[PDB]
Amino acid sequence: HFEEPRQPLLNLEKKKTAKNILDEQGADAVVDYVKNTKEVLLTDTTLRDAHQSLLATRLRLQDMKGIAQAIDQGLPELFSAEMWGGATFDVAYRFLNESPWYRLRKLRKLMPNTMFQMLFRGSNAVGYQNYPDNVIEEFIRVAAHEGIDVFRIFDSLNWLPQMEKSIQAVRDNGKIAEATICYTGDILDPSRPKYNIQYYKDLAKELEATGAHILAVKDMAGLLKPQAAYRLISELKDTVDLPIHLHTHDTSGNGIITYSGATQAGVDIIDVATASLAGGTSQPSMQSIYYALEHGPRHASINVKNAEQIDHYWEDVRKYYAPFEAGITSPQTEVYMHEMPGGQYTNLKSQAAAVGLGHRFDEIKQMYRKVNMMFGDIIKVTPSSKVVGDMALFMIQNDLTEEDVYARGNELNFPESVVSFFRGDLGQPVGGFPEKLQKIIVKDKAVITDRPGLHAEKVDFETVKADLEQKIGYEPGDHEVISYIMYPQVFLDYQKMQREFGAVTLLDT
Amino acid sequence: FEEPRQPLLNLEKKKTAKNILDEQGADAVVDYVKNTKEVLLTDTTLRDAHQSLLATRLRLQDMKGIAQAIDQGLPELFSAEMWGGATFDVAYRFLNESPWYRLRKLRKLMPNTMFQMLFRGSNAVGYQNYPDNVIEEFIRVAAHEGIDVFRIFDSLNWLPQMEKSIQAVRDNGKIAEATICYTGDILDPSRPKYNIQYYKDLAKELEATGAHILAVKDMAGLLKPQAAYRLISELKDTVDLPIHLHTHDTSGNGIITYSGATQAGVDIIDVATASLAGGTSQPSMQSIYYALEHGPRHASINVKNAEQIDHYWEDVRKYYAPFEAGITSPQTEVYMHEMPGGQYTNLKSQAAAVGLGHRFDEIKQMYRKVNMMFGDIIKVTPSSKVVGDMALFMIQNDLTEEDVYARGNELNFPESVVSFFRGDLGQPVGGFPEKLQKIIVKDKAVITDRPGLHAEKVDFETVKADLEQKIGYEPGDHEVISYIMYPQVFLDYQKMQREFGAVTLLDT
Ligand SMILES: [Mg+2]
Ligand SMILES: [Mn+2]
Ligand SMILES: [Mn+2]
């Protein structure tokens, strides 16, 4: 039994938001507004990333609705609200039995003046596998039409060919394209020169050569240290003219100091979560970041009293999600050794428990680090982090070392995600694959070296629409066709649950 | 429960501040701190980290498994905060182990680690005031048993209640840390009572005493990063003593505040091990290392060894699940209500025990208003207890400020509020509010000088003989001092010793 969640007591101020500028003057004017803003701007990750990291993405539309309008009116200073993409699309269907499209429509109505930001995985939009180009373009068209205003487009290997088409589609739909560099490694560690400052500079130059409106720096594992953050942001600001959007996780406890370091260097936007859903593997707290910068040269653009009022509601509704809580959470600097993103951390822990190795999770994480080194020190983020996690699980579960796969390897049946990674299905890693180990991994199957979307089976939306209309009881909308293409079986199971249980999204949590 | 993981250390064998103290004395330690370019770290894992997170319930049995690893694997530590605070009372009352026994065992296990204790000035580890000779005897015995650093503070930042303790610590050849409790916001012009000049003058006065180190205690984590930089700078250009900053991470800004203070030139900062850090506890030691890694000043610590130690601490924290606070998020409302973490938890518990937990929000608002009504006082033990009790009283019987100011001449205010307004805790900065004080005491004697002057005299010979009667043997000096500080608690501990024996030897 729970009391009603506390409702915020706001002090409303009418301002013109970035969403209003986008609606009236387009993406370039929004870019100018961000460029002309002296304060650092904030993107609230509460609706997507905060509960993806802390609550296994299980946060429901019903709890979102009770506070969405309060966020829209009480925090008009926000650059945007990250409310879509990531694991939310799949999790909604699969586990919450609510449509991500329905969530987007309801929030869009409730939040007219808030810019809606989505995490978009480049060639595999919200999936884990590459889709043909027209599928990606159609997804982007529907997402922009239904109210996504900002597309943070990233590729799990920082491979620009996998991002170009999505960036172009976002621009063609009159929305804001965020081209993302995934940060990994340590630019201040000379012993690790692969992802050095020059690598990021060149990548940022290439991304700016695209039409991307904003350059995002995505630190999926909270690897960006404060001095590293200041240096990287400074070098990027000297290399390109796009506004910078930094996104970090607080898993090592250094999120606030990293954000302040980037703010000194001139970052434009930083990703924050509400205090009650912040810290740990989630983003740094928005209230905390306000007080960190309060009397410095640059302030955080936010109504902190209103944010503290909103946080009471978020604190109350988090209690509904006790079964999905991770547990005791402390700052964890081991993330600097094993570069596992939080989602990869929890999923790997769960899989090790199901496998029956939870007592050896320490050497599981060591295997993760060594597997990453064996694959060639790859950027570990969805879905590339799944590859490393699966390989490490496989190598501990059958007691393999590096030499075991390098000499005995030709006999083992490596997990399919490792195989798919080494066939080039995820794209091309920086510096290419390790040729010998690639030969061991893919014994005989075909290996591609170009954009996997080129080799994607063609999809025609008319036949898919007719077939879906047969499979479900009615004529599907464009969003439903796009969902069926991305997650075929998941969408059908969701339709089955809709026919059998109805809109359970209306139930209170 | 699995056996806690033991650290795999890489030992370096360097000379520590404890060695300098043992061979060359406190002044040489101060010079060593002054000459150190890096920021030095004080580990609060053994006292403050588990006082904040585990209700001070961490037992000697768990400390023993890792004490030597801390001593050898982290020789760079300036000191380990392992005594004082609520630990002294809690050990006896709830853990049924002697704080003196803990100190002796840890001292043996940690020969090269400087032991730091939180000392409450006029009170040693109690909540009331004690006569001067009792405080001096406590300091003598604590220094003899192995306490090397005494962080001496007074709950109202009143120097007369710290002078005697500082002098006794110096006379015993140990390091005296004179402490300013931080409160308010030195960068908020609308709250001028505790401005930068107040702290500067207090620091000058403290340096006039023989204090070796000036400590800035931010019991509630109120010190914001820009404020931290500015305050440490102004203090650094005011006095010559090294600065020792201690903050809590309640608002989520502990690390950034420490980095700001490191920029301003703070010499020592208080950190907890990662597994017992964050939230209402201190910022993480590993986190503070990686925060400063490539800046002008590094943190002096073997971070690999610290990360190894943290595995053990993480494992043993699981034994203390019944004492956990719960889901912990950064909380910037501490800037409004300046509750210290311990005051926060105890106030929550008391409100629940009287059926008011559903309105803890207005309870905290009452706490803030009560603080403003008492005159914006420094809220730390035991002064924070006074504000907490008054706020509980006013919500529980539905009073406002007008109620106590007009109708208040007939209610029975709680005794700790009465004791505070009688001057038993000392004299607040700016004095008491005249009308409220009269309404509060209503008949009783109000003193304006050091309460220890009017403390009933204590003679250790008669106390020792009486204690030897009450227990079955002749007590040591530490046992006499404990009996004077906590008479009933010590006797109940002796009863439990006679009945159950040394339960401290059991695993948690
Ligand atoms: Mg700007
Ligand atoms: Mn993220
Ligand atoms: Mn403290």
Numbering used by the authors:
A (entry chain D): 486 to 994
B (entry chain A): 487 to 994
In the authors' words:
The separation of reaction steps at catalytic sites does not reveal the large conformational changes in the PC tetramer that could be coupled to the function of the enzyme. To explore the conformational space of the tetramers we performed a multibody refinement using masks enclosing dimers of BC-BC or CT-CT catalytic domains at different layers (as the bodies shown in Fig. 1c). There are only a couple of patterns related to the CT domains: showing a positive correlation of the same catalytic state when they are in the same layer; and a negative one when they are in subunits from different layers bound by their CT-CT regions. We have also observed that the PC subunits bound by their CT domains show a negative correlation in their catalytic state.
